């Protein structure tokens, strides 16, 4: 396998004669393919947040759990999403979506979620006020494609309805392995937080899990099918 090329088939999987194991690698024998010295190791980290969004009920589509890419509400006219609290802001762009952390002094006041299509009207470090405009939906506004949603919380006192969500998603990360390094956990292995993904000669060069998630192996130096 040429340096800087990934594998089409994941480690420890059945393969057939003629099947491509890579753009340049075609298997001549049916068997079980195995990675040899992966040049790159990716990881997926789990991110939990409990986040609130207020949207008019004449818009909102009734759903218990929205999923990646799943269409969120409607919003006839470009409804401005106005802050229910006062604080500083933390503008966190998650893929196509956004997150606003209303913070006072040390601890945050509240945390609000912006679906794709609801654009931030503020900038991180700026101050908001009670009822002050935070974001603006253009209508549409579906939940992003890398993120999921669980535990619907619906509170409606009127035309507008406040929705608290338990929002969890997967943030990607990449580690470039060296010859010093030796990969430990297998492909698609569910890993804990702080665990050592890939060892090495001196621990300074090692790979320590930054959070709880799953590990992936890529760019094998070679692929041995037996």
């Amino acid at each position: 396998l040429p340096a800087g090329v990934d594998a089409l088939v994941k480690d420890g999987e059945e393969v057939v004669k003629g099947q491509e194991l890579a753009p340049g690698v075609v298997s001549r024998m049916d068997g079980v393919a195995l990675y040899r010295f992966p040049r790159r190791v990716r990881v997926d980290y789990l991110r939990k947040e409990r986040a609130a969004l207020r949207i008019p009920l004449s818009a909102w589509v009734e759903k218990e759990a929205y999923r990646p890419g799943e269409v969120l509400a409607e919003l006839s006219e470009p409804y401005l999403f106005r802050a229910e609290e006062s604080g500083v802001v933390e503008l966190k762009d998650l893929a196509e979506g956004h997150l606003i952390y209303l913070r006072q002094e040390e601890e945050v006041v509240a945390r609000y979620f912006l679906p794709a299509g609801m654009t931030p009207l503020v900038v991180e470090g700026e101050i908001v006020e009670v009822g002050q405009p935070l974001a603006e939906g253009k209508g549409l506004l579906r939940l992003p494609r890398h993120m999921t949603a669980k535990e619907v919380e619906a509170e409606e006192e009127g035309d507008s309805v406040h929705l608290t969500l338990f929002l969890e998603w997967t943030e990607p990360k990449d580690y470039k392995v060296a010859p010093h390094m030796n990969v430990i956990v297998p492909e698609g292995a569910k890993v804990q937080a702080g665990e050592k993904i890939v060892a090495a000669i001196d621990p300074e060069e090692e790979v320590i899990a930054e959070a709880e998630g799953v590990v992936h192996l890529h760019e094998p130096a070679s692929i041995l099918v037996v």
Partner: protein, 116 residues
């Protein structure tokens, strides 16, 4: 006319060399195996070289290693098999160091052959 030297030359010619990666991996697997034997020595209360050779008995061939050391070295059913059974009584954390050990043992052979 059946040269003894070309035999060995083409015999070592079958196993390719080793770059930095393969070499480091080998050595590391070896030391890992040996230290594994060091812990396994505290496991059943045995020696280093004892369990170390017991591993060989199960790897580089079974009956053949204990069969012809010469007329007397060590008994196969007595001082060997009991070592196999005695180390079979151990849980996960322990029993895995065995596989680590034998793995390192193979790595040693691969290392010697690669640099031949």
């Amino acid at each position: 006319t059946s040269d003894p030297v070309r035999q060995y030359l083409h015999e070592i010619g079958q196993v390719p060399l080793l770059t930095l990666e393969e070499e480091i991996d080998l050595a590391r697997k070896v030391e890992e195996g040996m230290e594994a034997i060091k812990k396994l020595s505290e496991a059943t209360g045995l020696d280093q070289e004892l369990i170390r050779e017991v591993v060989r008995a199960k790897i580089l061939g079974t009956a053949r290693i204990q069969k012809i050391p010469g007329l007397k070295e060590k008994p196969d059913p007595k001082t060997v098999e009991e070592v196999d059974g005695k180390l079979k009584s151990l849980p996960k954390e322990l029993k895995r160091y065995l596989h680590i050990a034998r793995e390192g043992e193979a790595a040693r052979q691969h290392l010697i052959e690669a640099n031949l």
